[PDB]
Structures are given as structure tokens and as C-alpha cells.
Amino acid sequence: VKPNYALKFTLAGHTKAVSSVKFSPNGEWLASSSADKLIKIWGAYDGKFEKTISGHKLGISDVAWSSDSNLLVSASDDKTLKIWDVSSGKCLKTLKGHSNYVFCCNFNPQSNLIVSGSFDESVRIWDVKTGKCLKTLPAHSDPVSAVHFNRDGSLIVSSSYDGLCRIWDTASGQCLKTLIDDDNPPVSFVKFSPNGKYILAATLDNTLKLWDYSKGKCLKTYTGHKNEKYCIFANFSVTGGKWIVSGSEDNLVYIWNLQTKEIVQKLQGHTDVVISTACHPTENIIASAALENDKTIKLWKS
């Protein structure tokens, strides 16, 4: 019925607000990115600091792992993405082509492609091996908040402050679907469900929503949190109970029962907006990170 997530570790060291935390697919590591221009690597279980990864010239808003937990891509205000080899710390490629801050990024499930969204209102698809831009999508009319690939990589989901979520054919770059509901709030986050049937989408009106994007229908609504200013990640938690996990601008982490949409827990301790959360791929471990007045990461376990 309900989770029992308790604070285990508080990770410190980013010198400015944290923007993103992500667990590696193999469950060994946690990567964080930050407005301090740095990427940091922590042990997923003991929170033990591993290394710092640097090279971006301005703050980073997102970081993402390749399927094999070997590479990272980061999206920065310096208008680049960078492909990092985690074990050697090398910047392998610097993807240039966006005309404004790069906000979000993800590998496809094969880690041969990267998708990015930017304040320049485009979605771009990059080749991992050459670091070149394969397509630019004129996706939105306002800044793009989130970009995600589906289970086979055949589709890409986009989110923007223009109020739309869009689905794209990865091979053609064609828009296959535009989702919006009865109000048009800025869409601040989007991602596919692990089975690839649904998109979970956040809007700046304090609302998360589960969509069946084929049927074009909102299935579930998750409310209770505070989310009007910032692009807060949300997650499907599947290692124990089937939850929805999201930060909040009231400094708490919210956990919903996915089916019944009830708040089943709130996690307390950050001293600022909880901007990013992440769910461990095989343990009941939640990572959370907060903004300028906190600068810490926290590992909770149930």
C-alpha cells in the first residue's frame, strides 16, 4: 500500500544549485549535473563520491546515461551537449548546432542517438559516434523542456512552454501527435512509461498527468505537489510498489500510488525546491536534488 522511504545519505559538493540526478542503468552510479558547470559521479548505494567531470563553460541543466552505463550526455547553457566517457572522464564529442541554451537530453535505448531540446525551440537528434546533428525539428513555439525516447527508439516525445507535448517519428522527424488538455499550461516535463504505452507529463499548474498517447487521452492525474516555476523531473518507480515520484517547489518529494493517484508519502529535508528525482533501476532507492539554497543530493531507501 505505502512506501517507507527513509533518508540514508546526504551528498554534498556541488557549489551551486543542482539541476539533475540520474541513476546509471546498471545501478552502480548516480550522476548529477549542476548550475556550477560540473557533473559529479556518486556510488548509488553508499553515496560515496567518485569523480567530477568538467568542461562545460556555463551551467548544466540535464545529464543522461547510455544504456551500457559507460557514457553521459549533458545539456548546458553554453549551447552545447557533451558526450563523456565516464571511466576516463574524457569529453568525446561536443555537439554544437543549438542556437540557445540546451535544456534536456537523452540517449535512445541503443545509445547510438542523442535527442536534445533547447530554448531555441527545436528538438535535435545527434549521432553518438560522430557527434553530428542528424536532424533539427522545428518542434515548438517556446522553449523545449523535455525530450525522451520510447522503448525501441522509434519515437521521441517533446514538451514545451508552448503547452504542447509532441510525438515524433525518429527516422523521419515528422510530428505524429500533438497532445494538449483543456487548459494550456506550460508543459515542464515529459517521458514515456517503461512499457512505452504512456507518457507522464508535468505542467506548471501543479499537475502531473498520465496520457495514453495512442488514444490521445489523459488516464490519470497526480496532484498535491507545488510546481509552477521549474522543470521538475518525474519518474515511474517500479522496483517495489508502482509509484509516481516527483520533486516539488515546497521542498518535498512526493510519491503517488500510480493506479489510485493517492499521495502515499512525502519526503522531507531539502531546504529548497526539489528539482530532480530518480528511481534506482533495481533497489528501492530514490535520489533527490535541490536548488541554490540547498545544493545537496539525498538518497532515500524504502
Added chain:
Amino acid sequence: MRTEP
């Protein structure tokens, strides 16, 4: 920019 309102 994610850390900014």
C-alpha cells in the same frame, strides 16, 4: 537554466 525560475 533549469535551476532558474
